[PDB]
């Protein structure tokens, strides 16, 4: 038993520029691939289960869940709610600048707690394996690093594999999550053919990663910088009180009310 949780970077800024750029690949083609991929997960196994969440500028909306019209049940109902939910979200869209980043951490938080409920809801005769697939397109928002790191470790503790697909702009945080969680980070070179990458890199089961031959994981440099002048640090000094990093020695924590006891 498995539970795929798809995450799509519903960022109107990059996708809007992508739309304005009139490129060969657009959000329309993207959601098509997602729906086909989602269908494939359920299609691959009668017992498999699936959930989809869209990370927008201001909301983490669930895309599940199917329709009741009865033309076709399993795939059509899922696709119809997905189209309806993305349309509701994207058609009934506002315009904001004050808070322009994609709510990635909130979407991941929703997914993790949702997975927790589901895995508890599942009987213990057989247990629900789960993984998250993140499709990132916009820029990596550092302001969520705290939450992002905290949710990575929660996924790690919860033994959840996280995979990520990045379009254009890369992400140190997300690639680091793939490395830590044991998933895989891949920069797709041909966004119009996105679906074929998904159906091979991210679709194989957890029980098949080990059996398939796939692109080796890209080694992630753990570049770090202190809050003071943001320079890169390989060896620095850390406040044992607040763990604020400072590249060079100093008498007081610029990050907090604490004078170091220097000797």
């Amino acid at each position: 038993l498995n539970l795929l949780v798809i995450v799509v970077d519903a960022n109107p800024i990059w996708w809007g520029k992508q739309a304005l750029k009139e490129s060969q690949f657009t959000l329309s083609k993207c959601i098509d691939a997602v729906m086909v991929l989602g269908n494939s997960h359920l299609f691959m196994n009668r017992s498999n289960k699936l959930a989809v969440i869209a990370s927008h500028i201001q909301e983490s909306r669930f895309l599940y869940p199917g329709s009741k019209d009865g033309k076709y049940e399993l795939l059509t109902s899922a696709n119809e709610v997905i189209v309806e939910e993305i349309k509701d979200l994207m058609t009934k869209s506002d315009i904001k600048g004050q808070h322009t980043e994609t709510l990635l951490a909130g979407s991941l938080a929703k997914a993790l707690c949702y997975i927790h409920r589901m895995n508890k809801e599942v009987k213990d005769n057989q247990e629900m394996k789960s993984r998250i697939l993140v499709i990132k397109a916009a820029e990596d928002s550092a302001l969520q690093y705290m939450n992002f790191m905290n949710v990575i470790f929660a996924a790690q503790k919860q033994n959840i594999l996280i995979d990520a697909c990045v379009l254009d702009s890369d992400s140190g945080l997300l690639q680091q999550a793939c490395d830590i969680t044991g998933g895989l980070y891949l920069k797709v070179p041909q966004m119009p053919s996105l679906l074929q990458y998904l159906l091979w890199v991210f679709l194989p089961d957890q029980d098949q990663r080990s059996q398939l031959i796939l692109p080796p994981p890209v080694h992630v440099d753990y570049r770090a910088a202190c809050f003071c002048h943001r320079n890169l640090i390989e060896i620095g000094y850390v406040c044992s009180v607040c763990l604020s990093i400072f590249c060079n020695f100093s008498p007081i924590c610029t990050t907090c009310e604490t004078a170091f006891k220097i000797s």
Partner: peptide
């Protein structure tokens, strides 16, 4: 929890990058 009687240090720490 910690009090001001303990050393409020600025410990030096290394963040070496993995190298295959």
């Amino acid at each position: 929890p910690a009090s001001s009687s303990s050393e409020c240090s600025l410990i030096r720490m290394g963040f070496p990058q993995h190298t295959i």
